[PDB]
Structure formats: C-alpha cells, structure tokens
Design a protein around this ligand. Structure first.
Ligand SMILES: Nc1ncnc2c1ncn2[C@@H]1O[C@H](COP(=O)(O)OP(=O)(O)O)[C@@H](O)[C@H]1O
Lengths: 627, 270, 193
C-alpha cells in the first residue's frame, strides 16, 4: 500500500530535522544526542516515544503500530550505515570482526547489530487485558498488564552461524531468526563449488553472534477474571537488552507486540493451522512492586526527615496496623516486631536466627484470619495457606519441566519462597500429621530437608512463621490443661518464643464497644475518627525499613540485671508445682526482642526500661487463665 | 597467528618463562618465606624429589609482570595454555636433564574474582574465565569416550587403527590400504578411552536471591580430576563457558537456536 | 599378530603338563579325565601355577587379556585333542583362581581393561537364565550356505556376502537353529561392598 522510498526520506528527515524544544535548554537534537551516544558506544538501545512521532508525522504514527516488524528493520538499516562521528578492539563481537578482517559472500550489516531500538507509547497506553486480546491483535504493538510466574534465567540466542570448509577458507553467512534450522552442506561456495576441491565447513561462534534470550511464564491478575471462569496465562519472549527485567511476584506492566508462532513438527497434530501463538516485547515498566513504585532501587534519609521529626511516638505506629477494630493492642506491636527484627551477627561462627515465630490459640470468634490476611498483604513478600489447602510438596519444593532448558529442576512451595520475611499459616492443628516435623525443622533456621529425591534436598529458608490454630471441642475445660485440651505436638509447642492464646469471656460493656467499633466499618470505609492520625501504609513501608540497619551492641551495665530478670522469670512461674512449662531458651529469647525494639529507636541505646515492656510481655504471655 | 586469534605462542612462552625466573615468591615475598629463589624451581624440586606430578598455579602471581598476559589469557585460554606446558618441560630439563621427561603436567590456574555469583551472568562472557561456587549435589559414574578404533581383515591381517580429530574420521576401501583385498572391517574394543563424568552444583553462599531456589549448574570431568571430590562440600570452580547446540526433535536433524552452556574442568578448591 | 607368543607359551605349558605337572603327578588332566565322558567344556586353572613354571605370563596375560582370551580356547582344544579321538566341539569355560590381587569398584578407569582383578560385594535383584542362539549359518540364497563363521559377535549381524559364489550380499539365507552354537548365562546387579 505504501512506499519504501519517500517514507525512508521522511524517517531520515525525522532522524536529522529534530530539535524538539519541549522546554528551556532543548535547542539541540534529542535523537542527535542519542546518535552521538551511539557514537560513544555507551548506549546500545534507544527508547522511542510517540510525542516525537506525534509532532513529526501521522503515518508511521499509526502505520507502525499495526506492523511493527518492517518499519523497525528499515529503522535498523537506516541507522546501521549512518556514521556521522575512534577505536576498534573494545567489544567482543566487534573485536572478533576486527580480528577477522585484520586477518584479511558479503557480510550483512545485520551481523554488526551493535545498537537497537524499542518503543514507549503515550498516554502504557491503557491496561489492555490478556483475555481481551481478540481477533485483531496480530502485529499490533499493544500495551497490557499481566502477572509474572515461574521465571528462568538468561540464555544466549543465535542469529547467524558461520562455517568454514578448511579447504577454501570460506566464511559463510547462515542467519537464523526462528527456533529450528539446519546448517549447510559441505561446500556451498564457488571456490568450493562442484569442483572437487571441497572439504566440509564447520561452525565457529567467534565470528558468529549470540543474543540475550530470557523466558518466563505470565499469569493473570485474578482481579478481572470473569465471574465464572479460571485464570489464564500467556508466554513471554523478552528479547534484546531486557533480560532479567522481572521477578516472581511483580505485578508487571509489559509493552510489546503480539505475534504468532509456528511450532514446526509433526504435520498432523501440529500443522493443523491452529496458531499456538506467543508474545514479544521490549519494555518492562512494572507499575506494582518494582523499581519504579518502590524507591531505593528503605534507607533514603532526607526525603523522610520532614515527617521523621514531624512525629515522635510508638503506639501511633502501634494501632495503625489493621486499624478497623479496637482491642488486642499488645498483640499488634509485638507483631510489628516480627516485620523488623534485625538482629544479625556471626558470633563464635554460630549464626543466630532473628525471626520471631508465634502462634494463635483459642478461636471462639477473634478475627484470627484477619490479622493474617491483612499483614500478609502489607508485609512485603508474604504468603498464606491453611490445613488442607496444600500437601507437603505444596509447602516444600516440587518438580516440573522447564521451557527454558527442560532441566526438571525443583520449584518450592509457600515456605520455600517466603524467606527473608514471614509466611503465614492458619488453623495449624488440622494441617497434617507429618507436617509438624516439617515445621519442627525451621526452628533450626535455614534448614529445609526433604526426601523428594531424598538425596540432600538442601535449601536455605530464612523465614519467620505466623502460626494460628484453634482449640478442639471446648476451650480450657475446668479440668483440662495445655496438651490436654490441645492435641498439638508439645515438642512443637516448646520451640516457640511467644505463645499466644486469645480467649474472650463475656464482658458486659466491651461488647457494645466493639459493636460501635466494627459497625462504623460498614457505614463508611475508615474507622479511627478524630482521636489520632493513623499512618499511611506507604510511609509505613519505609519507616520500618530504616530502623533495621542499626545492629546495636548490648548493655553490660544491665547484663548484671537481665540475668536477675530471668531469675524472677523462672522463679515466679516455678513457685507452683504444675504450671505450664517455663523454658531455658527464655534468656536466648528476651535478648532477641529488645534488639529489634531498639531498632525502631535506631540508636544503640537499649535501656533498663527497654526490656521493662518485654518482662510484662512474657509475663502475660502465660498465666492467661488466672481470672 | 592462528585463525581467530591475535596472539602468538612464542611471545607468551618467553614472557611466562621470564616471569617464572623473575620470581622470588613475589606474590607473598614482595606483596606480603626465607626463600629468595623462584617458587617454581623449588616446586620442580618438590615435583621431582617426589616424582608426584600435577602442579597448580594461581593467577595472582601474574599481576607482578605485565597485566597484558592476564588479559590475553582471559580472552583465549583454550588456545594459549600448552605453551606454558612446554615452558614447564623446559624447566624440567633446567632442573635435571635425565628426569622423567615423558609424563606431562596440567596447569591449574584460578582466582580472577567472583563475577557476582552464578545467578547474574551474560552472553558476552562466552569463552573466557570465571570462578564461582556453592554446593555439590551428586556423585555419578564415569564414562569412556573414543579417540581411535581397532580393525581387521582375513588375508595378511590388516590390523590397523585410525583416530579422531574431533568428529571426522577417514577410511579407504581398506585399512592400511594396498591393492584393495576386501572392504572395511570394524571392531571397536582394542582401543583408547578417556574418562569423563557429570556432577551437578548449587549456589549456597549467602549470594542468594531471597525467596528463590538456587539456580543450579553442571560440570564435566577429565581424567585425573574425575571424582576428585566427595559430595557434600562447598567447592569453587575454574573453567570456561563451553557451549553446544540442542537437537530439535531427534526424529529430524534440525537444531535449536538455544545453545546450552556448561563449564569445563580446570581446577577445584577443597 | 599379538597372541602367537601366548600360543607358543601355553603350547609349552601344555607340553610340560603333558608330562607331570606336580612331582610326577597331574592336577589338570583328571578334571579333563572326568570331562572326557560328557565334555562339559570347563577346566579352571590356578594363576599361581603360572607364577611357578611359566615364569610370569601375568604381565603377558593380565593386560591384553581379551585379545589373548580366545586363543586360550584353541589352547584348550590343542590339549584335549592330544589323547582323545577329538572333534572341534571342545569349548572354553574358565573359573580362574589363585590370583593375589583383590580390589574394589573405585579403582576403575579407562586404563583397567583386559585384566583379572578380584572383587566382592553382595547379590541383589538377580535375573534368570536367558538363552542365546549365538551362532547359525547365513549367506546368499543360491546354494552355498554352510557357514561356520564368526557370527557370534556381540552386536549381531545377519549380513554376510558369500563364501563360494559371487551373489547377493544383502539378501540373506535363512537361519540355523539346528547344528550351530548355543550357550547359557544370566545377569545380575551387585551393590557396594
Ligand atoms: N471486634 C471485632 N472487630 C472486627 N472484626 C471482628 C470482631 N469480632 C469478630 N470479627 C470478625 O470475626 C471474624 C473471625 O474469623 P476468624 O476468627 O479469623 O476465623 P478462624 O476462627 O477460622 O480463624 C473476622 O473475619 C472478623 O470479620
């Protein structure tokens, strides 16, 4: 329909006649700045935005969006043989080319790639959805948002493979762009022509190319899936210089071109003219939980100082966590201790784990699943599962074929990936019988031993654990005791730092309090009125991260009394014969909480009153049935 | 110059010889032993007073000289090494003329630096030098591999052989051909074979992506390095990105765009 | 050819044990005397006696074994023929013994072939008899098919050209299950010692 000549001149004019003066100090050539940047051998891929091509022309402002495959290759050979501006031996490919001509069937300029171009639409055009890519999205560079899943690692793709007969020194060019091909016969040359002087040519990657070639799987948002449907997926082939531009768990926004795919093979199942398509892209601007929306890619001090001195309190950060009810204040703050932690060292070679793991016991209506489902959202890199929501292999590693290689590698479960954070579990008792050993193993941290292949199954899990389960028929029968009313492994009950049971007996005036508390969750969408300024989650995210980097010392001036505190601890529970267990690991636990609590001081000034809260914390953690 | 190279064997030979002679254990006598002698004639004493072969180097010795040989050994190590072998065999005769000058020695360099770790790698470092580490996974059995065959006949006993270049062999109508008494007779037993074996490897320093399984690699083996180590150890690797295509189908002979990568065997670090 | 030295060596070994082998007595004919009726095709030999009288054929025997191996069947035949009215039915089973060196699975490389080294272990998941018509008769189809050849090779191959005529070399004659060579073995695995 359109021409390849005046169009060529128009795009050259665009390349040159371009000093788009968006503001003051813009009187030079933007694409000419990019040109000399190519001349630096610094930049190797230009990104393009419609505003330039919005103001220049209109054809190719709408002509390239549907094809994207010709005008780019014209752009390629346009700039490939434009040398307006050394050194030769700097790039491994170019230095191998200059090896090969310093040593000295025409070479293409496709061999000397040496620079690329992508695109960048204007106004991430819109969030077009993986479902709605209907029968008009062939070739069109469409903007869409998806969800990442099951990423693999960088692989080198090939474009041009050269042989050499070794009898005529032939340097053949056998370029390839698909997946499969075959090389050429022994002598497809003229010196090595039908004349008998022929050997057999052989490949040399030296004067050949390779390319970054990453592959991942792409799953749906699970927010716009149909009402009675199931999540779908699509495949990625992110080429060029964007390999390693996604991670498992990034709500990414990918912009590229849909294309078809020919899985060449058996002409009956395949070869049915059914088009098992796939995707192509250039630009990965992940708008959710990536380098863009999350800064520091939290330690940036100046931007937060204005709010830092703007407030000075702790409980203000306390009840800002799940602030839609009232009650259970002392649980939330210590839970916030779980997010930070921050006690790391290598003392005497032995590494100490600083991830608190606590449970929730007793559930005649407490909102047990609420704190878990909330903090698993706010807590970056969280998960959630239940008793029969997953088998043992669902929690641990697994196996699956690999589209990158097919190595049949191991992929892990929820706990396999939630390390350096907190994996949430609910209703622990009915999880499984052998599962208790599976959670017994994390108490010797960074140790996930499996018998899947049963060889080593080594793995480094550095996760916390947010446990929560229910009592059996009844809730502390008048004669029953711990390990009697509960039917959990008491050895498992031993390996925690804080045990947490939540029992609510009738309180004739607290019920009306919560009734007016939660009923206002429904007439509107915000609980705390005019009594304190609960903090935004987003500022919470950085305010927690800044506290982590202190790693204070320990006060010897109170070490003399921390042991006395352990004395009164182990004695006032020991005054009776058969109270619940009181463990010798308490002194290894009390040290681990006061540190993270001082982390939010960011001061290395752990004080005598610092543990004064921890003492009552463990004090009430037990003796929860006295009244 | 060799075809795809820009170097020469003799210059590297001479400069490595002078480097080993200009040597006072300087990597830890100049930089950091009551020995104002080369460690290398000392080591050939140690090799010959034992007659226990199999040297090793470290590439931090070769900083003291020109940094060029470090570069032109990083770029083309698969082509440069045996000149150092003949330098070693010259030092053999320099140490003792009537020595055991028929058993040959390796060379086991190491230590440029950690790249970052095995997760973060590129295409362009495709035939160059790496050293990363983690943990060992398996310990599998060894495999022969042909380099030449035996053959036969019935009249006059044409009892012959012919070897491999890498993948291309010849045969006339006979073996040791004269006058064409028969056609070609193949046996494949009375022959020479070389050891090799595959062993998988992990990444487990703390060079780990949080919430990620270790992306694992794989290593070949060669003769006196085969089951060099027992499993359940952290060991560093010294080797070269060494690639090969994949076979599309198998029912056909087409080949896939995905060249695979794996590391050859040079030296390990118990 | 290599093994003519082993031919002469075991020839004179025969020629000595043809006379006495031990103090005017023989320990390696009376097994053959019991053999002489059914002809079961076994006679084990001490390797120590190789160290006694033949003076170190170990390094003659213990590296290039497999190529020397079949020549010792012909040696056995040249023994049994000396005194009994003999057909070439004679065959070579061997149950070697009296060897000093006893190694394990780990000292195994590509350089360890054609030897007689000794090993132990345990027996697991054993497997049955599995016969083999190792031999037969095979050539062109005109008339001249009587083929006592070497078709017992491991990889098995129908294709043989001819003996007498010039004829087809891809069209086989049919097979012989009647007047041929058959033998018996089994197969197991063995675990670490
Ligand atoms: N005071 C309260 N404030 C807010 N929500 C509450 C309150 N009391 C009860 N609820 C409700 O009770 C529910 C408790 O469910 P939950 O106890 O998590 O189930 P399970 O016992 O299986 O863990 C919560 O979802 C919450 O909506």
């Amino acid at each position: 329909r359109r021409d390849y000549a005046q169009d060529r001149e128009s795009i050259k004019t665009f390349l040159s006649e371009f000093c788009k003066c968006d503001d003051d100090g813009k009187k030079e050539f933007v694409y000419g700045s990019q040109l000399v940047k190519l001349a630096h051998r610094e930049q190797v891929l230009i990104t393009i935005d419609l505003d330039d091509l919005a103001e220049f022309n209109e054809s190719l402002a709408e002509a390239v969006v549907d094809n994207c495959r010709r005008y780019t290759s014209i752009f390629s050979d346009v700039i490939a043989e434009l040398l307006p501006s050394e050194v030769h031996a700097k790039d491994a490919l170019d230095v191998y080319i200059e090896h090969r001509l310093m040593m000295e069937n025409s070479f293409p300029s496709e061999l000397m790639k040496r620079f690329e171009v992508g695109f960048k639409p204007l106004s991430t055009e819109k969030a077009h959805s993986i479902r709605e890519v209907k029968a008009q999205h062939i070739g069109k560079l469409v903007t869409v948002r998806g969800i990442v899943t099951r990423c693999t690692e960088v692989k080198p793709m090939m474009v041009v493979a050269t042989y050499t007969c070794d009898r005529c020194g032939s340097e053949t060019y056998q370029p390839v762009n698909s997946l499969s091909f075959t090389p050429v016969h022994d002598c497809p040359s003229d010196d090595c022509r039908v004349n008998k002087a022929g050997g057999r040519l052989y490949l040399q990657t030296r004067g050949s190319k390779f390319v970054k070639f990453q592959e991942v799987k792409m799953q749906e948002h699970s927010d716009q899936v149909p009402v009675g449907h199931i999540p779908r997926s699509m495949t990625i082939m992110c080429r060029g210089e964007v390999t390693r531009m996604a991670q498992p768990g990034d709500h990414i926004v990918v912009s590229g071109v849909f294309l078809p795919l020919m899985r060449t093979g058996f002409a009956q199942m395949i070869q049915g003219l059914l088009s098992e398509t796939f995707l192509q892209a250039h630009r990965i601007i992940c708008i959710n939980k990536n380098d863009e929306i999350s800064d520091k890619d939290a330690e940036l001090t100046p931007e937060e100082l204005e709010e830092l001195a703007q407030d000075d309190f702790y409980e203000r950060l306390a009840t800002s966590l799940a602030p839609e009810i009232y009650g259970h204040l002392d649980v939330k703050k210590a839970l916030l201790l779980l997010l930070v932690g921050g006690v790391d060292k290598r003392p005497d070679g032995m590494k100490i784990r600083g991830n608190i793991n606590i449970c929730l016991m007793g559930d005649p209506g407490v909102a047990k699943s609420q704190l878990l489902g909330y903090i698993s959202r706010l807590a970056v890199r969280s998960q959630y599962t239940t008793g029969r929501g997953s088998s043992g292999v669902g929690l641990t590693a697994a196996v699956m074929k690999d589209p990158l290689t097919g190595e049949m590698t191991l992929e892990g479960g929820a706990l396999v990936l939630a390390d350096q954070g907190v994996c949430c579990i609910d209703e622990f008792d009915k999880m499984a019988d052998q599962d208790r050993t599976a959670i017994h193993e994390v108490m010797e941290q960074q140790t996930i031993s499996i018998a899947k292949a049963g060889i080593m199954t080594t793995l480094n899990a550095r996760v916390s654990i947010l446990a929560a389960a229910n009592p059996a028929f009844g809730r502390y029968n008048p004669r029953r005791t711990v390990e009697q009313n509960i039917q959990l492994p008491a050895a498992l009950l031993s390996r925690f730092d804080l045990l947490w049971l939540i029992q609510d007996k009738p309180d004739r005036d607290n019920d009306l309090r919560l009734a007016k508390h939660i009923t206002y969750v429904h007439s509107h969408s915000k609980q705390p009125p005019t009594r304190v300024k609960a903090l935004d989650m987003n500022l919470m995210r950085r305010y927690i991260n800044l506290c982590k980097r202190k790693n204070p010392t320990i006060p010897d001036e109170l070490t003399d009394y921390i042991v006395g505190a352990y004395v009164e601890l182990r004695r006032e529970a020991r005054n009776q014969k058969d109270m619940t267990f009181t463990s010798a690991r308490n002194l290894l636990g009390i040290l681990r909480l006061s540190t993270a609590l001082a982390r939010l001081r960011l001061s290395d000034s752990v004080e005598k009153d610092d543990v004064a809260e921890a003492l009552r914390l463990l004090e009430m953690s037990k003796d929860s049935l006295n009244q | 110059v060799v075809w795809g190279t820009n170097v020469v064997v003799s210059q590297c030979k001479s400069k490595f010889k002078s480097f080993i002679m200009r040597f006072i254990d300087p990597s830890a006598e100049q930089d950091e032993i009551d020995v104002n002698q080369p460690l290398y004639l000392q080591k050939l004493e140690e090799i010959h007073t034992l007659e226990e072969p199999y040297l090793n180097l470290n590439c931090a010795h070769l900083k003291t000289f020109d940094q060029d040989l470090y570069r032109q050994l990083i770029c083309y190590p698969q082509e440069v090494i045996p000149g150092f072998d003949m330098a070693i065999n010259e030092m053999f005769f320099e140490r003792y003329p009537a020595a055991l000058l028929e058993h040959q020695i390796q060379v086991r360099p190491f230590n440029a630096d950690k790249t970052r770790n095995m997760r973060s790698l590129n295409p362009e470092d495709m035939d160059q030098l790496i050293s990363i580490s983690g943990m060992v996974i398996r310990s599998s059995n060894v495999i022969p591999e042909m380099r030449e065959a035996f053959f036969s006949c019935n009249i006059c006993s044409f009892s012959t052989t012919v070897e491999v270049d890498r993948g291309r062999i010849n045969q006339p109508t006979l073996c040791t051909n004269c006058n064409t008494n028969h056609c070609f007779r193949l046996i494949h037993n009375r022959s020479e074979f070389t050891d090799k074996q595959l062993v998988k490897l992990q990444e487990s320093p703390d060079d780990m992506a949080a919430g990620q399984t270790p992306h694992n690699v794989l290593l070949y083996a060669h003769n006196d390095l085969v089951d060099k180590v027992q499993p359940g150890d952290r060991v560093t690797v010294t080797g070269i990105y060494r690639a090969t295509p994949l076979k599309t189908g198998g029912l056909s002979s087409s080949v896939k765009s995905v060249y695979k990568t794996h590391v050859d065997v040079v030296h390990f670090r118990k | 050819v290599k093994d003519e030295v082993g031919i002469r060596a075991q020839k004179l070994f025969q020629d000595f044990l043809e006379e006495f082998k031990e103090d005017g007595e023989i320990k390696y004919t009376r097994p053959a005397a019991s053999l002489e009726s059914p002809d079961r095709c076994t006679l084990e030999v001490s390797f120590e006696d190789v160290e006694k009288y033949d003076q170190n054929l170990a390094t003659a025997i213990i590296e290039e074994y497999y190529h020397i191996y079949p020549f010792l069947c012909q040696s056995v035949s040249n023994y049994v023929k000396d005194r009994i009215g003999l057909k070439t039915q004679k065959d070579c089973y061997v149950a070697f013994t009296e060897v000093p060196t006893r190694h394990k699975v780990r000292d195994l490389t590509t350089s360890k072939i054609g030897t007689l080294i000794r090993i132990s272990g345990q027996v697991v998941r054993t497997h049955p008899v599995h016969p083999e018509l190792v031999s037969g008769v095979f050539m062109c189809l005109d008339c001249q098919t009587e083929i006592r050849n070497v078709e017992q090779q491991f990889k098995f191959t129908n294709p043989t050209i001819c003996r007498n005529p010039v004829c087809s070399n891809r069209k086989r004659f049919m097979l012989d299950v009647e007047k041929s060579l058959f033998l018996d073995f089994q197969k197991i695995r063995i675990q670490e010692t």
